[PDB]
Amino acid sequence: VPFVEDWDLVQTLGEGGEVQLAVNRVTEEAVAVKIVNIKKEICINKMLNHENVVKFYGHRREGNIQYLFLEYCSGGELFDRIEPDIGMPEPDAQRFFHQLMAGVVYLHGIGITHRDIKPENLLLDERDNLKISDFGLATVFRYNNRERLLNKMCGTLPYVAPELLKRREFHAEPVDVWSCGIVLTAMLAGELPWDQPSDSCQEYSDWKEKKTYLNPWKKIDSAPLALLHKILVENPSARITIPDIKKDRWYNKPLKKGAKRPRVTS
Ligand SMILES: O=C1Nc2cc(Cl)ccc2Nc2ccccc21
């Protein structure tokens, strides 16, 4: 079929190079094209195949420019579904948190840590299905069933675990668990609890002192707040693991109806 390899760049999606929406000349199929750790990003992306992870279609090199062909998520960023200082309805947040956990379980299972989980990197498709995006900061923490401890400073300060700022070495998995907890906090309260998880940060000190009568915690129901109490634990060895997050009472609380399905009466 001629012209099937031709794509038109029709809109800018993100900055960093840049990301553009590409539409196939023949089929009108929409894909995201990333124009540009790059050799590592392609390498990690080639290992990935999961319904809650942005799909990698392939790459091409035109001289100094690298082109990454990725799944286009028309719903945009989770960040834009969060109303400032409000959040979003608790059942939506629970459904997004379930899909985030499925994606993170998948990645950890193949020994990959994302290292920059935040609502800007959680994209939504046309059915509002969450997809983990951008593996530019991602790394392998388990190879030949041997765990490698990390020491590199990666991420975004409001979402980083406190061990990254306090310890030379740390386990990868509790770091991603912590950022998911900050994502859950943002979805339920529409605000970030602190600039960074350090003792110098009053907001962080208040949380360790259990002053939940203050914001953002006073906007959050006791059931998801009990889960946040288990995730946002300073000691990464005492922090809840994903298998135990899946056993949490709020995580398993019926809240949300399925997608509105067409129906008639009489
Ligand atoms: O797939 C995307 N979908 C998007 C769609 C809209 Cl309408 C806005 C923003 C993104 N977010 C993205 C950011 C980087 C790379 C791709 C996207």
Side-chain angles (χ1 to χ4, degrees), residues 134-146:
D134 189 355
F135 288 85
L137 297 193
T139 200
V140 185
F141 71 89
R142 194 198 304 109
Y143 198 85
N144 287 332
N145 200 49
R146 274 297 282 171

Side-chain angles (χ1 to χ4, degrees), residues 51-52 71 73-78 80-81 88 91-93 95-97 99-100 122-131 256 259:
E51 58 270 28
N52 296 117
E71 188 187 347
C73 307
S74 67
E77 306 178 3
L78 181 63
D80 297 309
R81 300 301 180 90
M88 70 175 73
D92 295 17
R95 175 182 173 274
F96 290 137
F97 193 71
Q99 301 180 342
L100 177 55
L122 303 167
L123 307 181
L124 300 174
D125 73 2
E126 69 285 352
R127 284 178 181 175
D128 270 359
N129 289 310
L130 178 150
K131 323 279 189 150
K256 204 172 207 281

Side-chain angles (χ1 to χ4, degrees), residues 17 20 24 27 35 43 49 61 69 86 124 164 187 191 198 213 240 266:
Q20 276 170 91
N24 196 275
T27 69
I35 289 104
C43 177
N49 182 46
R61 187 187 177 90
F69 294 83
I86 295 288
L124 300 174
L164 189 133
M187 298 197 283
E191 75 179 292
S198 61
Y213 54 82
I240 198 175
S266 275

Side-chain angles (χ1 to χ4, degrees), residues 11 13-14 19 32 71-77 120 123 133:
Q11 203 191 339
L13 300 174
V19 177
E71 188 187 347
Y72 174 66
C73 307
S74 67
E77 306 178 3
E120 303 87 333
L123 307 181
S133 181

Side-chain angles (χ1 to χ4, degrees), residues 36 38 59 61-63 65-67:
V36 177
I38 194 53
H59 70 287
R61 187 187 177 90
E62 279 174 22
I65 319 141
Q66 272 272 13
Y67 297 89

